[PDB]
Design a protein around this ligand. Structure first.
Ligand SMILES: *[C@@H]1O[C@H](CO)[C@@H](O)[C@H](O)[C@H]1O[C@H]1C[C@](C)(N)[C@H](O)[C@H](C)O1
Ligand SMILES: *[C@@H]1O[C@H](CO)[C@@H](O)[C@H](O)[C@H]1O[C@H]1C[C@](C)(N)[C@H](O)[C@H](C)O1
Ligand SMILES: *[C@@H]1O[C@H](CO)[C@@H](O)[C@H](O)[C@H]1O[C@H]1C[C@](C)(N)[C@H](O)[C@H](C)O1
Ligand SMILES: *[C@@H]1O[C@H](CO)[C@@H](O)[C@H](O)[C@H]1O[C@H]1C[C@](C)(N)[C@H](O)[C@H](C)O1
Ligand SMILES: [Cl-]
Ligand SMILES: [Cl-]
Ligand SMILES: [Cl-]
Ligand SMILES: [Cl-]
Ligand SMILES: [Cl-]
Ligand SMILES: [Cl-]
Lengths: 7, 7, 7, 7
């Protein structure tokens, strides 16, 4: 992971 | 990054 | 930073 | 911590 979102 | 720690 | 993860 | 070194 490590990214974010939210989709 | 974006996480924290400390390890 | 410099550490890693993942949490 | 989080920095390095070495002193
Ligand atoms: C985390 O570090 C290792 C060691 O250098 C790499 O092999 C790996 O690709 C790296 O992970 C990437 C992908 C991730 C977890 N989604 C984050 O983007 C991190 C910062 O980089
Ligand atoms: C990021 O979203 C996940 C779900 O996929 C939550 O479980 C987690 O609480 C959330 O992370 C927080 C803490 C972090 C990783 N240090 C960052 O500040 C993010 C933006 O919010
Ligand atoms: C940083 O030094 C400490 C001692 O104070 C060691 O125990 C540790 O192994 C070392 O950390 C590694 C792993 C890290 C934190 N992801 C970085 O890559 C550093 C440079 O090396
Ligand atoms: C880590 O994040 C918290 C939440 O925002 C701050 O309150 C804290 O000052 C921060 O820690 C600093 C000091 C440290 C651990 N030596 C590193 O430089 C990190 C990135 O920032
Ligand atoms: Cl990943
Ligand atoms: Cl999402
Ligand atoms: Cl750390
Ligand atoms: Cl993480
Ligand atoms: Cl500190
Ligand atoms: Cl040192």
């Amino acid at each position: 992971x490590x990214n974010x979102x939210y989709x």
